[PDB]
Amino acid sequence: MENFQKVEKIGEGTYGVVYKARNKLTGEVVALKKIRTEGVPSTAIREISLLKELNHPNIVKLLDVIHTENKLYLVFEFLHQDLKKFMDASALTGIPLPLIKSYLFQLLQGLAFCHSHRVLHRDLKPQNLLINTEGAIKLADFGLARAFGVPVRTYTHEVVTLWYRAPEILLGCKYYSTAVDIWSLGCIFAEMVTRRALFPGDSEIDQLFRIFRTLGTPDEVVWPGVTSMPDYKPSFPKWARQDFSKVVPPLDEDGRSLLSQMLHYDPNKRISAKAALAHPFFQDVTKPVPHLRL
Ligand SMILES: NC(=O)c1ccccc1NCc1cccnc1
Secondary structure, eight states, X not given: OOSEEEEEEEEEOSSSEEEEEEETXXXXXXXXXXXXXXXXXXXHHHHHHHGGGOOOTTBOOEEEEEEETTEEEEEEEOOSEEHHHHHHHTTTTOOOHHHHHHHHHHHHHHHHHHHHTXXXXXXXXGGGEEEOTTSOEEEOOTTHHHHSOOOSXXXXXXXXXXXXXXXXXXXXXXXXXXXXXXXXXXXXXXHHHXXXXXXXXXXXXXXXXXXXXXXXXXXTTTSTTGGGSTTOOTTSOOOOOOOHHHHSTTOOHHHHHHHHHXXXXXXXXXXXXXXXXXXXXXXXXXXXXXXXXX
8 A cells, every 4th residue: 555655643543543644646645444354345345336326515535445464454635633622722711602503503414324324333433523614513523433333442442432322322222213313413502502521421320320320220111112221220320300401501492492402312203303303492503614733
């Protein structure tokens, strides 16, 4: 692979290291990801290849899939910053509401597109939401989870974050639905608003109990079928639900109403991306430009 000159290490992903690189022939600047192997599953090659056709303005474009020497490389369009860094850089003053709303609106458009094509992300987090100088925000790594799997540690034994995982996944449900992505985005929306993670669990049970402490321990009334989930235990403590006004102050009622629908326990009652786009919170949406210092 001498068709690319590594410019720097953009980081270490869940599957492999990611590099910023320039195509020696085209001059194009791209993001190159080396994927974890002994023969490379043929099942994963066809799945990944299908994603090359999943193109939308709010989805990071997958340019090419290169298979070789027990090694798989994914070539993606390059963006200069991620939302995790932007939030840290905006920690003192906070991201202005108009920009938070623009970003949430664009992310829901991207989810609506992928979900209409039967593609789920499964591991949304600030680190895989990328931004540019024009005020655009895009989702990175859609569909890779299903193509492969989701280990506990990265290739460098790094600890995978559980902060954005939906309760049905934590309770052992075997079949994920588009609803898991809406839950993760709701958690990110709350974090942009308050400037602190909503549910920063440091273990699977701590993550689950942090959710229960805030939204109340779920029961058959609010979540039909919950007591029959694979990892549900009758011994779970029973915490009362807290008021949203206390969860994401000082967000207005339009915002709290939308957030509450994105965080419904029952995956079937949780709002869809398409329906969320029509919520009154977006009546005055615009597209501001962020101040990025690259
Ligand atoms: N597609 C990409 O461009 C990308 C891929 C993986 C991780 C971060 C990424 N960009 C944002 C970024 C963050 C830090 C430094 N330079 C770029």
